[PDB]
Amino acid sequence: DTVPAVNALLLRLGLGRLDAAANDNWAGPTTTGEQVFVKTVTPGCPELDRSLSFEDLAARLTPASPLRSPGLLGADPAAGVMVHRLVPGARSGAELALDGDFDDDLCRSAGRAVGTLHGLPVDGLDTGEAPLPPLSWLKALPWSAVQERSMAQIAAWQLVQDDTEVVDALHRLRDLERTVPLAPAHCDLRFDQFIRADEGAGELYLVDWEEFRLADPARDVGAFAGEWLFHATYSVFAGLTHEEIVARGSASLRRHLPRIAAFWQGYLECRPQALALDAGLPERAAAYAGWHMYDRLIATAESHATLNPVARAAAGIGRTVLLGPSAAARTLGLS
């Protein structure tokens, strides 16, 4: 498909061709033996324009920044190809969290990276709003998107569409973005956008800046809390009463709260003025974590025909967080 355009950039960059030891993605050695991560986005191409707006600012960053990103080797934006240096022995944060290696310490380094990111010239950046949550989809899915989703996903969408309180809360959260101090924000954070080198022992890298914008810093804070929420109330569990699933889920969250607290301490170490500028940052972040729950449940529903009771319950925790961000902010330790 897109191999021509990828082999053409690698050739023009001196990286040879992709060896057989490796939209679509590619990682591994080049004929020249350089380890590269090839990303392709179908195209101009705005995700790559956002990626590049990050790589410009990341260049003006010390190797002592809590925020590290893989070096950009090149790009052909009109073909939707980017190439970066592969992180040696890359272990994603999703792998780490599944193995219990995403510890409090690593969560603090994530907050420092994210806190650092939000303090970094904002002139080259997209100020378009990120379609997350997708507000038009809360009214009506595009027919073509219905035909690319599972029955469980479709059911998960209808439940949110028919929940006026949630739909209203999401419209307000997105409305509030233009009334707050904006920051350079990743806007699509998940544990898998965090990479450690050296097979889990190395430094932390933040990647995937195709949604990088000048945006509400709550998006990233909420996203990180939301991942712990979803991990604690869903991932670790995937014939019981619903009250049991909520109880087991509430206790998993409580045991995972220090992960969120650590991130937020990290965050504030590197961005000590966040609340002096935004008192409602904790609350908006809580609301984003609440949406993030739905987002992650809907995505995982991809390979399901029904919504199991754990997903139904987990959803119910997000409605609580989104409809009660203030209290959720205190429960979550973002106060």
Tell me the closest approach of the beta carbon of residue 163 to other proteins, in angstroms.
12
Q: Does 276 bind other proteins (CB under 8 A)?
A: no
Q: Does 302 bind other proteins (CB under 8 A)?
A: yes
**CB 135, CB 169: distance < 8 Å:** no
Name, in order, each residue with C-beta under 8 angstroms of 257's C-beta and a sequence gap of 6 or more: 331, 332, 333
For other proteins, the binding residues in 127-186 under the rule CB under 8 A are: 136, 139-143, 146-151, 154-155, 157-158, 161
Name, in order, each residue with C-beta under 8 angstroms of 144's C-beta and a sequence gap of 6 or more: none
Please give the Cα distance from 301 to 125 (Å, whole number): 33
Residue 5, token pair as written in the block = 């355009």
Q: Does 14 bind other proteins (CB under 8 A)?
A: no
Contact segment (CB under 8 A) with other proteins among 26-34, 85-93, 100-108, 300-308 equals: 300-308
Please give the Cα distance from 44 to 77 (Å, whole number): 7
Nearer to other proteins, 139 or 172 (CB): 139
Please give the Cα distance from 49 to 210 (Å, whole number): 8
Tell me the closest approach of the beta carbon of residue 306 to other proteins, in angstroms.
5
Query: For the residues of 222-246, what is the DSSP string, one character each?
Result: HHHHHHHHHHHHTGGG----HHHHH
Nearer to other proteins, 56 or 165 (CB): 165
Nearer to other proteins, 141 or 218 (CB): 141
Give the count of residues interacting with other proteins (CB under 8 A).
23
Q: Buried (b) or exposed (e) across 64-78, using 16+ Cβ within 10 A?
A: ebbbbbbebbebbbe
Please give the Cα distance from 45 to 80 (Å, whole number): 6
Q: Does 257 bind other proteins (CB under 8 A)?
A: no
For other proteins, the binding residues in 304-323 under the rule CB under 8 A are: 304-306
Nearer to other proteins, 31 or 306 (CB): 306
Q: Does 247 bind other proteins (CB under 8 A)?
A: no
Place of tokens 């932390």: 204
Nearer to other proteins, 161 or 265 (CB): 161
* Contact positions vs other proteins (CB under 8 A): 136, 139-143, 146-151, 154-155, 157-158, 161, 239, 302-306
